[PDB]
Amino acid sequence: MEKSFVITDPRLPDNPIIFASDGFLELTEYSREEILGRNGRFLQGPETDQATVQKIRDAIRDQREITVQLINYTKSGKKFXNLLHLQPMRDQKGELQYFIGVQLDGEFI
Ligand SMILES: Cc1cc2nc3c(=O)[nH]c(=O)nc-3n(C[C@H](O)[C@H](O)[C@H](O)COP(=O)(O)O)c2cc1C
Ligand SMILES: [Cl-]
Ligand SMILES: [Mg+2]
């Protein structure tokens, strides 16, 4: 599959997605119109582990890189195990500019 990633802007309210790769559209079944401007949490559902979601919150708070695995859902409701890579990206002034989130689909341990 093509590379699945989104880029968020934490200088906007609730860190919305401002770019979604074609691979992300493919992986999640959503259209670019249905993704842009929302927080990445929209992929979570009932089976998503809340301890892992907390770990994500904390990494985003402390602006630190993290890799977690967690259950997400496609538009039509299919489960998929998301090995999610989050990385802060700072400008040359050392100010947080974006977050990049890269998803790999599958059961990875
Ligand atoms: C760039 C980026 C990509 C993200 N991608 C995903 C994702 O693919 N799946 C997911 O469940 N959460 C993803 N998140 C996590 C949620 O956006 C959110 O940070 C997490 O649920 C914790 O915050 P909350 O407790 O307010 O929901 C991503 C966050 C960022 C910054
Ligand atoms: Cl967030
Ligand atoms: Mg939540």
Side-chain angles (χ1 to χ4, degrees), residues 32 34-64 66-91 93-96:
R32 195 168 273 111
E34 292 174 306
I35 294 157
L36 293 192
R38 65 198 309 172
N39 184 280
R41 73 171 65 89
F42 84 96
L43 295 167
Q44 298 163 12
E47 192 61 34
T48 305
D49 188 328
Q50 297 305 308
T52 309
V53 181
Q54 182 51 52
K55 297 171 161 84
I56 294 164
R57 276 189 287 264
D58 290 343
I60 296 184
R61 189 191 59 233
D62 301 333
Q63 306 169 0
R64 300 196 68 76
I66 197 177
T67 299
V68 292
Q69 201 187 233
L70 90 166
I71 287 309
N72 277 177
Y73 299 78
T74 73
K75 192 186 167 158
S76 61
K78 190 152 51 171
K79 293 171 186 189
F80 76 91
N82 176 353
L83 179 74
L84 175 66
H85 226 20
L86 298 183
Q87 194 177 355
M89 168 137 20
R90 318 197 146 257
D91 68 20
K93 317 174 179 177
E95 308 185 79
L96 184 71

Coordinates of all heavy atoms in Angstrom, one line a residue, residues 32-96, unseen atoms left out:
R32 N -11.0 12.5 1.5 CA -10.2 13.6 2.1 C -11.1 14.7 2.7 O -10.7 15.3 3.7 CB -9.3 14.2 1.0 CG -8.2 15.1 1.5 CD -7.1 15.4 0.5 NE -6.0 14.4 0.4 CZ -5.8 13.5 -0.6 NH1 -6.6 13.5 -1.6 NH2 -4.8 12.7 -0.5
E33 N -12.3 14.9 2.2 CA -13.3 15.8 2.8 C -13.8 15.4 4.1 O -14.2 16.3 4.9 CB -14.5 16.0 1.9 CG -14.2 16.6 0.5
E34 N -13.8 14.1 4.3 CA -14.3 13.6 5.6 C -13.2 13.5 6.7 O -13.5 13.0 7.7 CB -14.8 12.2 5.4 CG -16.1 12.1 4.6 CD -16.5 10.7 4.3 OE1 -15.6 9.9 3.8 OE2 -17.6 10.3 4.6
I35 N -12.0 13.9 6.3 CA -10.8 13.8 7.2 C -10.3 15.2 7.6 O -10.0 15.4 8.8 CB -9.7 13.0 6.5 CG1 -10.1 11.6 6.3 CG2 -8.4 13.0 7.4 CD1 -9.3 10.9 5.2
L36 N -10.0 16.0 6.7 CA -9.4 17.3 6.9 C -10.2 18.1 7.9 O -11.4 18.2 7.9 CB -9.3 18.1 5.6 CG -8.3 17.6 4.5 CD1 -8.0 18.6 3.4 CD2 -7.0 17.2 5.1
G37 N -9.5 18.6 8.9 CA -10.1 19.4 10.0 C -10.5 18.6 11.2 O -10.9 19.2 12.2
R38 N -10.4 17.3 11.2 CA -10.8 16.6 12.4 C -9.5 16.1 13.1 O -8.5 16.0 12.6 CB -11.8 15.5 12.2 CG -11.4 14.4 11.3 CD -12.6 13.6 10.8 NE -13.5 13.3 11.9 CZ -14.7 12.7 11.7 NH1 -15.1 12.5 10.4 NH2 -15.5 12.4 12.7
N39 N -9.7 15.9 14.4 CA -8.7 15.3 15.3 C -8.6 13.8 14.9 O -9.6 13.1 14.6 CB -9.0 15.5 16.8 CG -8.0 14.9 17.7 OD1 -7.9 13.8 17.9 ND2 -7.1 15.8 18.2
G40 N -7.4 13.3 15.0 CA -7.1 11.9 14.6 C -7.8 10.8 15.5 O -7.7 9.6 15.1
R41 N -8.4 11.2 16.6 CA -9.1 10.3 17.5 C -10.3 9.7 16.9 O -10.9 8.7 17.4 CB -9.5 11.0 18.8 CG -10.6 12.0 18.7 CD -11.1 12.5 20.1 NE -10.0 13.2 20.7 CZ -9.9 14.5 20.5 NH1 -10.7 15.2 19.7 NH2 -8.9 15.2 21.1
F42 N -10.8 10.3 15.8 CA -12.0 9.8 15.1 C -11.9 8.4 14.6 O -13.0 7.8 14.4 CB -12.3 10.8 13.9 CG -11.6 10.5 12.6 CD1 -12.3 9.8 11.6 CD2 -10.4 11.1 12.3 CE1 -11.7 9.5 10.4 CE2 -9.8 10.8 11.1 CZ -10.4 10.0 10.1
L43 N -10.7 7.9 14.4 CA -10.6 6.5 14.1 C -10.8 5.5 15.2 O -10.8 4.3 15.0 CB -9.2 6.3 13.5 CG -8.9 7.0 12.2 CD1 -7.4 6.9 11.9 CD2 -9.7 6.3 11.0
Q44 N -10.9 6.0 16.5 CA -11.0 5.1 17.6 C -12.5 4.6 17.7 O -13.4 5.1 17.1 CB -10.6 5.8 18.9 CG -9.1 6.2 18.8 CD -8.7 7.2 19.8 OE1 -9.4 7.5 20.7 NE2 -7.5 7.8 19.6
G45 N -12.6 3.5 18.5 CA -14.0 3.1 18.7 C -14.0 2.3 20.0 O -13.0 2.2 20.7
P46 N -15.1 1.6 20.3 CA -15.3 0.8 21.5 C -14.2 -0.1 22.0 O -13.9 -0.2 23.2 CB -16.6 0.0 21.2 CG -17.3 0.8 20.2 CD -16.3 1.5 19.4
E47 N -13.6 -0.8 21.1 CA -12.5 -1.8 21.3 C -11.2 -1.1 21.5 O -10.2 -1.8 21.9 CB -12.5 -2.8 20.2 CG -11.7 -4.1 20.5 CD -12.2 -4.9 21.7 OE1 -13.4 -4.9 21.9 OE2 -11.3 -5.5 22.4
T48 N -11.0 0.2 21.3 CA -9.7 0.9 21.5 C -9.3 1.0 23.0 O -10.1 1.5 23.8 CB -9.8 2.3 20.9 OG1 -10.2 2.2 19.5 CG2 -8.4 3.0 21.0
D49 N -8.1 0.6 23.3 CA -7.6 0.6 24.7 C -7.4 2.0 25.2 O -6.5 2.7 24.7 CB -6.4 -0.3 24.7 CG -5.9 -0.5 26.1 OD1 -6.1 0.3 27.0 OD2 -5.3 -1.6 26.4
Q50 N -8.1 2.4 26.3 CA -8.0 3.7 26.8 C -6.7 4.0 27.5 O -6.2 5.2 27.4 CB -9.2 4.0 27.7 CG -10.5 4.0 27.0 CD -10.5 5.0 25.8 OE1 -10.2 6.1 25.9 NE2 -10.9 4.4 24.6
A51 N -6.0 3.0 28.0 CA -4.6 3.2 28.5 C -3.7 3.7 27.4 O -2.8 4.6 27.6 CB -4.1 2.0 29.1
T52 N -3.8 3.1 26.2 CA -2.9 3.6 25.0 C -3.3 5.0 24.6 O -2.4 5.8 24.3 CB -3.1 2.6 23.9 OG1 -2.9 1.3 24.3 CG2 -2.1 2.9 22.8
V53 N -4.6 5.3 24.5 CA -5.0 6.7 24.2 C -4.4 7.7 25.2 O -4.0 8.7 24.8 CB -6.6 6.8 24.2 CG1 -7.0 8.2 23.8 CG2 -7.2 5.8 23.2
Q54 N -4.3 7.3 26.5 CA -3.7 8.2 27.5 C -2.2 8.4 27.2 O -1.7 9.5 27.3 CB -3.8 7.6 28.9 CG -3.2 8.4 30.0 CD -3.8 9.8 30.0 OE1 -5.0 10.1 29.9 NE2 -2.8 10.8 29.9
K55 N -1.5 7.3 26.8 CA -0.1 7.4 26.4 C 0.1 8.4 25.2 O 1.1 9.1 25.2 CB 0.5 6.0 26.1 CG 0.4 5.0 27.2 CD 0.8 3.6 26.7 CE 1.3 2.7 27.8 NZ 0.1 2.0 28.5
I56 N -0.8 8.3 24.3 CA -0.8 9.3 23.1 C -1.0 10.7 23.6 O -0.1 11.6 23.4 CB -1.8 8.9 22.0 CG1 -1.5 7.6 21.3 CG2 -1.9 10.0 20.9 CD1 -2.6 7.0 20.6
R57 N -2.0 10.9 24.5 CA -2.3 12.3 25.1 C -1.0 12.8 25.7 O -0.7 14.0 25.5 CB -3.3 12.2 26.1 CG -4.8 12.3 25.7 CD -5.7 12.4 26.9 NE -5.8 11.2 27.6 CZ -6.8 10.3 27.5 NH1 -7.8 10.5 26.6 NH2 -6.8 9.2 28.2
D58 N -0.4 12.0 26.5 CA 0.8 12.4 27.2 C 2.0 12.8 26.3 O 2.7 13.7 26.5 CB 1.3 11.3 28.2 CG 0.4 11.1 29.4 OD1 -0.4 12.0 29.7 OD2 0.5 10.0 30.0
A59 N 2.2 11.9 25.3 CA 3.3 12.2 24.3 C 3.0 13.5 23.5 O 3.9 14.3 23.3 CB 3.4 11.1 23.3
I60 N 1.8 13.8 23.2 CA 1.4 15.0 22.5 C 1.6 16.2 23.4 O 2.2 17.2 23.1 CB 0.0 14.9 21.9 CG1 0.0 13.8 20.8 CG2 -0.4 16.2 21.2 CD1 -1.3 13.7 20.0
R61 N 1.2 16.0 24.7 CA 1.4 17.1 25.7 C 2.9 17.4 25.8 O 3.3 18.6 25.8 CB 0.9 16.7 27.1 CG 1.0 17.8 28.1 CD 0.7 17.2 29.5 NE 1.7 16.2 29.8 CZ 1.4 15.0 30.3 NH1 0.2 14.5 30.4 NH2 2.4 14.1 30.6
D62 N 3.7 16.4 26.0 CA 5.2 16.6 26.2 C 5.9 16.8 24.9 O 7.2 16.9 24.9 CB 5.8 15.5 27.1 CG 5.1 15.4 28.4 OD1 4.5 16.4 28.9 OD2 5.1 14.2 28.9
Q63 N 5.2 16.8 23.8 CA 5.8 16.9 22.5 C 7.0 16.0 22.2 O 8.1 16.4 21.9 CB 6.1 18.4 22.2 CG 4.9 19.3 22.4 CD 5.2 20.8 22.4 OE1 6.3 21.2 22.2 NE2 4.1 21.5 22.6
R64 N 6.7 14.7 22.4 CA 7.7 13.6 22.3 C 7.2 12.6 21.3 O 6.0 12.3 21.2 CB 7.8 12.9 23.7 CG 8.3 13.8 24.8 CD 8.8 13.0 26.0 NE 10.1 12.3 25.8 CZ 11.3 12.8 25.7 NH1 11.5 14.1 25.9 NH2 12.3 12.0 25.5
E65 N 8.2 11.9 20.7 CA 7.8 10.9 19.7 C 7.3 9.6 20.5 O 7.8 9.3 21.5 CB 9.0 10.6 18.8 CG 10.3 10.1 19.6
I66 N 6.4 8.9 19.8 CA 5.9 7.7 20.4 C 5.4 6.7 19.3 O 4.9 7.2 18.3 CB 4.7 8.0 21.4 CG1 4.5 6.8 22.3 CG2 3.5 8.4 20.7 CD1 3.4 7.0 23.4
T67 N 5.6 5.5 19.6 CA 5.0 4.5 18.8 C 4.1 3.6 19.6 O 4.5 3.1 20.6 CB 6.1 3.6 18.1 OG1 6.9 4.5 17.3 CG2 5.5 2.5 17.2
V68 N 2.8 3.4 19.2 CA 1.9 2.6 19.9 C 1.2 1.7 18.9 O 1.2 1.9 17.7 CB 0.8 3.4 20.7 CG1 1.4 4.2 21.9 CG2 0.0 4.3 19.8
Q69 N 0.6 0.7 19.4 CA -0.3 -0.1 18.7 C -1.7 0.0 19.3 O -1.8 -0.1 20.5 CB 0.1 -1.6 18.6 CG -0.5 -2.3 17.4 CD -0.2 -3.8 17.4 OE1 0.3 -4.3 16.5 NE2 -0.5 -4.4 18.5
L70 N -2.7 0.1 18.4 CA -4.1 0.3 18.9 C -5.1 0.0 17.8 O -4.8 0.2 16.6 CB -4.3 1.7 19.5 CG -4.7 2.9 18.6 CD1 -5.1 4.1 19.4 CD2 -3.6 3.3 17.6
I71 N -6.3 -0.4 18.3 CA -7.4 -0.8 17.4 C -8.1 0.4 16.9 O -8.5 1.3 17.6 CB -8.5 -1.6 18.2 CG1 -7.9 -3.0 18.5 CG2 -9.8 -1.7 17.5 CD1 -7.4 -3.6 17.3
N72 N -8.2 0.5 15.5 CA -8.9 1.6 14.9 C -10.0 1.0 14.0 O -10.1 -0.3 13.9 CB -8.0 2.4 14.1 CG -7.2 3.5 14.9 OD1 -6.4 4.2 14.3 ND2 -7.5 3.7 16.2
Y73 N -10.8 1.8 13.4 CA -11.9 1.4 12.5 C -11.9 2.2 11.2 O -11.7 3.4 11.2 CB -13.3 1.5 13.1 CG -13.5 0.8 14.4 CD1 -12.9 1.2 15.6 CD2 -14.3 -0.4 14.4 CE1 -13.2 0.5 16.8 CE2 -14.5 -1.1 15.6 CZ -14.0 -0.6 16.8 OH -14.2 -1.3 18.0
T74 N -12.3 1.5 10.1 CA -12.5 2.1 8.9 C -13.9 2.7 8.8 O -14.7 2.5 9.7 CB -12.3 1.1 7.7 OG1 -13.5 0.3 7.7 CG2 -11.0 0.3 7.9
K75 N -14.1 3.5 7.8 CA -15.4 4.1 7.6 C -16.6 3.1 7.7 O -17.6 3.3 8.4 CB -15.5 4.9 6.3 CG -16.7 5.8 6.2 CD -16.8 6.4 4.8 CE -18.2 7.0 4.6 NZ -18.2 8.0 3.5
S76 N -16.4 1.9 7.1 CA -17.5 0.9 7.1 C -17.5 0.0 8.3 O -18.3 -0.9 8.4 CB -17.4 0.0 5.9 OG -16.1 -0.6 5.9
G77 N -16.7 0.4 9.3 CA -16.7 -0.3 10.6 C -15.8 -1.5 10.8 O -15.8 -2.1 11.8
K78 N -14.9 -1.8 9.8 CA -13.9 -2.8 9.9 C -12.8 -2.4 10.9 O -12.3 -1.3 10.9 CB -13.4 -3.2 8.6 CG -12.5 -4.4 8.6 CD -12.5 -5.2 7.3 CE -12.1 -4.3 6.1 NZ -11.9 -5.1 4.9
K79 N -12.5 -3.4 11.8 CA -11.3 -3.3 12.7 C -10.0 -3.4 11.9 O -9.9 -4.1 11.0 CB -11.3 -4.4 13.7 CG -12.5 -4.3 14.7 CD -12.5 -5.6 15.5 CE -13.7 -5.6 16.4 NZ -13.6 -6.8 17.4
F80 N -9.1 -2.6 12.4 CA -7.7 -2.8 11.9 C -6.7 -2.2 13.0 O -7.1 -1.4 13.9 CB -7.5 -2.1 10.6 CG -7.3 -0.6 10.6 CD1 -6.1 0.0 10.8 CD2 -8.5 0.2 10.5 CE1 -6.0 1.4 10.8 CE2 -8.3 1.6 10.6 CZ -7.1 2.2 10.7
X81 N -5.8 -3.1 13.1 CA -4.8 -2.9 14.2 C -3.7 -1.8 13.7 O -3.1 -2.0 12.7 CB -4.0 -4.2 14.5
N82 N -3.5 -0.7 14.4 CA -2.8 0.4 13.8 C -1.5 0.5 14.6 O -1.5 0.8 15.8 CB -3.7 1.7 13.9 CG -3.0 2.9 13.4 OD1 -1.8 2.9 13.0 ND2 -3.7 4.0 13.3
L83 N -0.4 0.2 13.9 CA 0.9 0.5 14.5 C 1.2 2.0 14.1 O 1.6 2.3 13.0 CB 2.0 -0.4 14.0 CG 3.4 -0.1 14.6 CD1 3.5 -0.5 16.0 CD2 4.4 -0.8 13.8
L84 N 1.0 2.9 15.1 CA 1.0 4.3 14.9 C 2.3 4.9 15.4 O 2.6 4.8 16.6 CB -0.2 5.0 15.6 CG -0.3 6.5 15.6 CD1 -0.5 7.0 14.2 CD2 -1.3 7.0 16.6
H85 N 3.1 5.6 14.5 CA 4.4 6.3 14.7 C 4.0 7.8 15.0 O 3.7 8.4 13.9 CB 5.2 6.2 13.5 CG 6.7 5.8 13.7 ND1 7.4 5.2 14.7 CD2 7.6 6.0 12.7 CE1 8.6 5.1 14.2 NE2 8.8 5.6 13.0
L86 N 4.0 8.5 16.1 CA 3.8 10.0 16.2 C 5.1 10.7 16.4 O 5.9 10.3 17.2 CB 2.9 10.3 17.4 CG 1.5 9.7 17.3 CD1 0.7 10.2 18.5 CD2 0.7 10.1 16.0
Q87 N 5.3 11.7 15.6 CA 6.6 12.5 15.8 C 6.3 14.0 15.8 O 5.6 14.5 14.9 CB 7.5 12.2 14.6 CG 8.9 12.7 14.8 CD 9.8 12.3 13.6 OE1 9.4 11.6 12.7 NE2 11.1 12.8 13.7
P88 N 6.7 14.8 16.8 CA 6.6 16.2 16.7 C 7.6 16.7 15.6 O 8.6 16.1 15.4 CB 7.1 16.7 18.1 CG 8.0 15.6 18.6 CD 7.3 14.4 18.1
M89 N 7.2 17.8 14.9 CA 8.2 18.5 14.0 C 8.2 19.9 14.4 O 7.2 20.6 14.4 CB 7.8 18.3 12.6 CG 8.5 19.2 11.6 SD 9.1 18.4 10.1 CE 8.1 17.0 10.0
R90 N 9.4 20.4 14.7 CA 9.6 21.8 15.1 C 10.2 22.6 13.9 O 10.9 22.0 13.1 CB 10.6 21.9 16.3 CG 10.4 20.9 17.4 CD 11.1 21.2 18.7 NE 10.2 20.7 19.7 CZ 9.3 21.4 20.5 NH1 9.3 22.7 20.5 NH2 8.5 20.7 21.3
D91 N 9.9 23.9 13.9 CA 10.6 24.8 13.0 C 12.0 25.1 13.5 O 12.4 24.8 14.6 CB 9.7 26.1 12.7 CG 9.6 27.0 13.9 OD1 10.4 26.9 14.9 OD2 8.6 27.8 14.0
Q92 N 12.8 25.8 12.6 CA 14.2 26.2 13.0 C 14.3 27.1 14.2 O 15.3 27.1 14.9 CB 14.9 26.8 11.8
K93 N 13.2 27.8 14.5 CA 13.1 28.5 15.8 C 12.9 27.6 17.0 O 12.9 28.1 18.1 CB 11.9 29.5 15.7 CG 11.8 30.3 14.4 CD 10.5 31.1 14.3 CE 10.4 31.9 13.0 NZ 9.2 32.7 12.8
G94 N 12.8 26.3 16.7 CA 12.6 25.3 17.8 C 11.2 25.3 18.3 O 10.9 24.8 19.4
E95 N 10.3 25.8 17.6 CA 8.8 25.9 18.0 C 8.1 24.7 17.3 O 8.3 24.5 16.1 CB 8.2 27.2 17.6 CG 8.9 28.4 18.0 CD 8.2 29.7 17.7 OE1 7.2 30.0 18.5 OE2 8.5 30.3 16.7
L96 N 7.3 24.0 18.1 CA 6.5 23.0 17.5 C 5.7 23.6 16.3 O 5.0 24.6 16.5 CB 5.5 22.5 18.5 CG 4.6 21.3 18.1 CD1 5.4 20.0 18.0 CD2 3.5 21.1 19.1

